[PDB]
Each structure stands twice: as C-alpha cells, then as structure tokens.
Amino acid sequence: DVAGAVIDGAGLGFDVLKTVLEALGNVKRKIAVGIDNESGKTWTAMNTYFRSGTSDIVLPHKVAHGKALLYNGQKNRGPVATGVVGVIAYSMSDGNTLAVLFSVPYDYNWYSNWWNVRVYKGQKRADQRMYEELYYHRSPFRGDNGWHSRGLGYGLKSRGFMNSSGHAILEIHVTKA
Ligand SMILES: CCCCCC(=O)OC[C@H](COP(=O)(O)OCC[N+](C)(C)C)OC(=O)CCCCC
Ligand SMILES: CCCCCC(=O)OC[C@H](COP(=O)(O)OCC[N+](C)(C)C)OC(=O)CCCCC
C-alpha cells in the first residue's frame, strides 16, 4: 500500500489513501490518488502532466481488471507557492485513453478542489490542453467530500470522491455500465 504500487481493487479505500498521504509528510498541499479498475479491461501507463506541483512516483505500468493503482503528488518546495494540479493518462486495451484530473490549489481565497474523469477516443497523452479541457470544459466535480457518479460511454462508468482540504484524497472506481 505505497504509491507507485498496485493492490487488490477491493482493498482500495480512504484509510489506504490517508496512509499514502501521511508518508509524504508535512507539506501544505498534497494528494493521494486511488483508481480502482473494474472496467473489464487492462490499463497501461501513458503519463502524468502537472500544471502545478510534482510527483516522484512512477505510474504503475499495468493495472489489470480488479486492481487499483496508488499514486500521489505534492506542491514544489520552492519560493513561489503553487498547489498540486494535474492529469493522469492510462491507455485501455480497447485502444482508448482513461484520463483523470485533480486540482488542489494553493490559494483557497480564490480556488477550490476539483477533479474529473473521462475516456478519450483513441490514444491521447496527458498534457496542458487535456488539463484545460478537463478543468474548464468537461464539467469537473468539486472536491466536496461527496461521491459523484457518471457514465463514461464505451460501456464504462465512474464513481469517485475527493475531499475539500489541502491534504487531498481522490478515490475513483471505474466499472462497467
Ligand atoms: C492570489 C490570486 C491567485 C492568482 C491566480 C494564479 O495564477 O495564482 C495561482 C498560481 C497557480 O496556483 P495553483 O494553486 O497551483 O493553481 C491555481 C489553480 N488552477 C491552476 C487550477 C487554475 O500560483 C502562482 O502562480 C503563485 C502566484 C505567482 C507568484 C509569482
Ligand atoms: C473575495 C474574493 C471573491 C471570490 C473569487 C471567486 O469566486 O473565484 C473565482 C475563480 C475560481 O474559478 P476557477 O477554479 O477557474 O473555476 C471553477 C470552475 N471550473 C473548474 C469549472 C473552471 O477565481 C479566479 O479566477 C480569480 C482570479 C484571481 C486573479 C487575481
């Protein structure tokens, strides 16, 4: 149950993500991400894009049906405080791309937590344009400490939860529609 590892899908839950958060230690903005693949298809790491912050974790290479991937990120430790904001892309065995947005901002006087999930037709790389589409134009969800469900097309749907604070968790279950 460390970031960069793949666990039994059933084992993913809040406490696992809070354990991931806690290992990043004391930093004002960080996120632990859990994505449970019950899509009925194998995913293969494509990449992560960071609009703000970083991760030192390498995306788990393969996430089979029934596995969850664990991942994390944190703000930089430089002088110009940013948050942790980005997009993870996995290719699915159907030839399409699973994309996940997270946004844990620094200055909560102006911004709040957001996340999103979407399947892109075909192979697509996580990048600035994908972040923009996902943050500004694809009805992202609030990190409002509630669950949000959404049909993805392609025979798939998602159910996910993000909390509202600067120490963030994001848990997403991708299942069959
Ligand atoms: C305090 C007003 C916020 C102005 C908007 C902005 O771009 O600042 C937030 C920015 C990015 O903040 P971040 O929390 O990482 O993300 C804002 C959320 N997004 C990127 C999703 C819009 O953080 C900085 O660039 C620090 C200010 C520059 C000092 C030289
Ligand atoms: C007393 C402050 C009033 C509160 C400001 C506010 O409601 O924030 C709106 C917006 C936050 O909007 P955003 O994260 O872009 O919109 C959330 C909705 N989505 C995710 C769909 C784009 O922030 C800004 O762009 C301020 C720019 C500061 C420049 C100094």
UniProtKB/Swiss-Prot annotation:
Pfam families: Anemone_cytotox (PF06369)
Thermal activity characteristics from the UniProt entry: Stable up to about 53 degrees Celsius.
Chief subcellular location: secreted
Chain positions of motif Cell attachment site, crucial for protein stability: 142-144
UniProt: an N-(acyl)-sphingosylphosphocholine 2 binding residues: R51, S52, G83, Y106, Y111
GO cellular component: extracellular region; nematocyst; other organism cell membrane; pore complex
Applied value in biotechnology: Has been engineered for DNA analysis in nanopore technology.
Record carries keyword Aminoacyl-tRNA synthetase: no
Described purpose of this protein according to its UniProt entry: Pore-forming toxin (PFT) that consists of a crown-shaped octamer or nonamer that forms cation-selective hydrophilic pores of about 1.5 nm (inside) and 13 nm (outside). It causes cardiac stimulation and cytolysis (EC(50)=1.6 nM on erythrocytes). Interestingly, the Phe-14 is crucial for hemolysis.
Summary of subunit composition and partner proteins: Octamer or nonamer in membranes. Monomer in the soluble state.
Designated name of the protein: DELTA-actitoxin-Afr1a
Organism encoding this protein: Actinia fragacea (Strawberry anemone)
Lineage, uppermost ranks: Eukaryota, Metazoa, Cnidaria, Anthozoa, Hexacorallia
